[PDB]
Amino acid sequence: AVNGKGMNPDYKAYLMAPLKKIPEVTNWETFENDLRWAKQNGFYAITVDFWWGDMEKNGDQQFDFSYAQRFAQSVKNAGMKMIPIISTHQCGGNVGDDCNVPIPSWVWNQKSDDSLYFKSETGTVNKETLNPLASDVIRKEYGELYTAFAAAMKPYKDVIAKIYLSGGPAGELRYPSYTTSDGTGYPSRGKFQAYTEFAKSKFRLWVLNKYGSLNEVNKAWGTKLISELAILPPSDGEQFLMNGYLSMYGKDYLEWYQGILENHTKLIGELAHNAFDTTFQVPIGAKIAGVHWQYNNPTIPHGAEKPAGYNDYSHLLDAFKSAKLDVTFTCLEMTDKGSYPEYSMPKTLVQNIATLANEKGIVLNGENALSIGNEEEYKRVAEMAFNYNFAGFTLLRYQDVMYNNSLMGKFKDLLGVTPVMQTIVVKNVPTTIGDTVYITGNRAELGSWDTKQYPIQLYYDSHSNDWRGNVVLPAERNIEFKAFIKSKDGTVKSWQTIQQSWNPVPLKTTSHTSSW
Ligand SMILES: OC[C@H]1O[C@H](O[C@H]2[C@H](O)[C@@H](O)[C@@H](O)O[C@@H]2CO)[C@H](O)[C@@H](O)[C@@H]1O
Ligand SMILES: OC[C@H]1O[C@H](O[C@H]2[C@H](O)[C@@H](O)[C@@H](O)O[C@@H]2CO)[C@H](O)[C@@H](O)[C@@H]1O
Ligand SMILES: OC[C@H]1O[C@H](O[C@H]2[C@H](O)[C@@H](O)[C@@H](O)O[C@@H]2CO)[C@H](O)[C@@H](O)[C@@H]1O
Ligand SMILES: OC[C@H]1O[C@H](O[C@H]2[C@H](O)[C@@H](O)[C@@H](O)O[C@@H]2CO)[C@H](O)[C@@H](O)[C@@H]1O
Numbered sequence: 001a002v003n004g005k006g007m008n009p010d011y012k013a014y015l016m017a018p019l020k021k022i023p024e025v026t027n028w029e030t031f032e033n034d035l036r037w038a039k040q041n042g043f044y045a046i047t048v049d050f051w052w053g054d055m056e057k058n059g060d061q062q063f064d065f066s067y068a069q070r071f072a073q074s075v076k077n078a079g080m081k082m083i084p085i086i087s088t089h090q091c092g093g094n095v096g097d098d099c100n101v102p103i104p105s106w107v108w109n110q111k112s113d114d115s116l117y118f119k120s121e122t123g124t125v126n127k128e129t130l131n132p133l134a135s136d137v138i139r140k141e142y143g144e145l146y147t148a149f150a151a152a153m154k155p156y157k158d159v160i161a162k163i164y165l166s167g168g169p170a171g172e173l174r175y176p177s178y179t180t181s182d183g184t185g186y187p188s189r190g191k192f193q194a195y196t197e198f199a200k201s202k203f204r205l206w207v208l209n210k211y212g213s214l215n216e217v218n219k220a221w222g223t224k225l226i227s228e229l230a231i232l233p234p235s236d237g238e239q240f241l242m243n244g245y246l247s248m249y250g251k252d253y254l255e256w257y258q259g260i261l262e263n264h265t266k267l268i269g270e271l272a273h274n275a276f277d278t279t280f281q282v283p284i285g286a287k288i289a290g291v292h293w294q295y296n297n298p299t300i301p302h303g304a305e306k307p308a309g310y311n312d313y314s315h316l317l318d319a320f321k322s323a324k325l326d327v328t329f330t331c332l333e334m335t336d337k338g339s340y341p342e343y344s345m346p347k348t349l350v351q352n353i354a355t356l357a358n359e360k361g362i363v364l365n366g367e368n369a370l371s372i373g374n375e376e377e378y379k380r381v382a383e384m385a386f387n388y389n390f391a392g393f394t395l396l397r398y399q400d401v402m403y404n405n406s407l408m409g410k411f412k413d414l415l416g417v418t419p420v421m422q423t424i425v426v427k428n429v430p431t432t433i434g435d436t437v438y439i440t441g442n443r444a445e446l447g448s449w450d451t452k453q454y455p456i457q458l459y460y461d462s463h464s465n466d467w468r469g470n471v472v473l474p475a476e477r478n479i480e481f482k483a484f485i486k487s488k489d490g491t492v493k494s495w496q497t498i499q500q501s502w503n504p505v506p507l508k509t510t511s512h513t514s515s516w
């Protein structure tokens with residue numbers, strides 16, 4: 001893995017449940033058998049959306065957790081674990097959605113203004129989720145939902161491995177900047193989503209709070225605004241993305257815009273911890289979308305990310321660390337293209353996010369963005385997951401592998417692995433002053449024969465004069481590997497004589513000793 005390390009010893013594979021309720025897909029008996037099958041193939045738990053639209057449909061405080069309880073009961077029967085997603089967003093309208101579950105219709109009547117929803121540059125209204133700007137409503141509604149959910153699911157605390165919060169559309173912390181109705185669907189540029197009167201007034205107040213008066217604003221932005229009412233979001237999103245973002249005004253606008261999502265992260269994180277920490281004592285997470293298109297567009301750099309709310313990932317992740325939430329990046333199975341017209345750079349994006357997450361010490365999880373129908377994609381996922389320290393991978397979605405034995409078998413082999421610590425020992429290595437010994441092998445957990453970025457470092461044992469190290473390997477999988485010497489300058493000086501193998505790696509910790 002990166003930095004001479006190996007895969008994450010806590011790695012676990014998860015499976016996404018269908019978007020619809022199980023009884024709308026199959027029966028509970030078959031579902032339970034499917035879970036036993038998933039477990040046999042390396043899956044630790046199943047993640048599942050519990051829709052706000054289902055749990056508090058009739059009215060405020062009129063809860064119904066009967067489906068969640070019945071679902072948990074079957075997970076318990078199958079001897080599996082589950083990861084509930086408290087989905088306070090609408091099901092339907094997003095890529096892959098095969099459902100129709102809007103959030104409670106009554107929630108929209110708690111306000112007379114336009115503080116609750118989103119409005120784009122061109123006026124498109126979006127109601128897939130509550131606008132994070134309305135923190136007072138979010139505090140009340142999510143607070144009540146989380147606490148009621150916690151009380152009703154207490155009897156199943158033993159089958160809950162983690163809890164996911166929904167930070168926005170599709171359960172991701174972002175703005176609904178790419179939708180069909182707004183004409184911003186992939187691979188188009190996104191449109192900013194802060195044009196409701198409430199949003200305009202909030203940005204205005206934020207600007208005035210920062211500088212104090214209009215004169216100080218004009219002096220900081222180098223503008224000549226005639227009055228406070230002239231302080232507004234970008235009138236032309238495209239021109240803003242072309243060069244307006246480089247100005248002092250642009251930096252402030254994007255700081256505020258992304259700032260709303262950061263404050264939202266801290267709010268829901270606090271509500272969730274206060275509601276679940278004592279009862280469940282399990283990790284809590286949130287998701288960030290992989291907006292990979294228009295990444296390297298020369299005319300509008302990061303033209304899809306900025307409108308989605310992603311301007312500074314480092315600053316964004318600091319909000320997660322502060323709120324004590326683990327992060328999940330929802331797009332790992334893709335490769336870079338970076339050509340007109342998509343200017344898509346998914347892999348580079350994943351690498352950047354993973355690097356930042358590891359530096360900050362934030363637990364990182366991943367998912368595939370679209371259904372995988374080919375083994376080649378599993379390999380891509382494996383390379384990223386096992387070389388960038390991911391603690392977990394969630395496969396979208398249920399049916400893809402449950403009804404395809406060959407695919408399920410390939411997932412078991414490549415991703416449904418149980419990590420086990422093993423000791424690798426290499427003797428008679430002709431190292432000289434300044435050399436370091438590494439190992440690399442055929443599988444992704446071994447760096448896939450890469451000697452540049454992914455090799456695993458070994459340590460010299462001055463007492464027995466050999467090189468050794470405790471490395472995390474995939475139990476019960478066949479591996480081939482070789483040790484090699486790396487000079488002080490970084491060049492590969494020589495390789496181990498014979499290629500080593502472990503067929504397969506044992507499930508119990510032991511050691512593999514070989515000679516140069
Ligand atoms: O709030 C001030 C001003 O902001 C916007 O104009 C920006 C523009 O969006 C940027 O791309 C760049 O050109 O700087 C401008 C301000 O100097 C709004 O379009 C405008 O209505 C508003 O007054
Ligand atoms: O927020 C939903 C979803 O959006 C993006 O998925 C893209 C996908 O990568 C493209 O290949 C194409 O299908 O358009 C989709 C958007 O509608 C993000 O990549 C993903 O992380 C996110 O879950
Ligand atoms: O069941 C989880 C989640 O799935 C869908 O959103 C996905 C999207 O399809 C993929 O790109 C994935 O990688 O990221 C998103 C979140 O995991 C549904 O649209 C969403 O409502 C649902 O919660
Ligand atoms: O390119 C991947 C390749 O890596 C290893 O081959 C080494 C070989 O072991 C060395 O003796 C020397 O020839 O450099 C090669 C790298 O090009 C693996 O042994 C091999 O199986 C694998 O395909």
Ligand SMILES: [Ca+2]
Binds near residue numbers: 060061140141144145
């Ligand atoms: Ca309520």
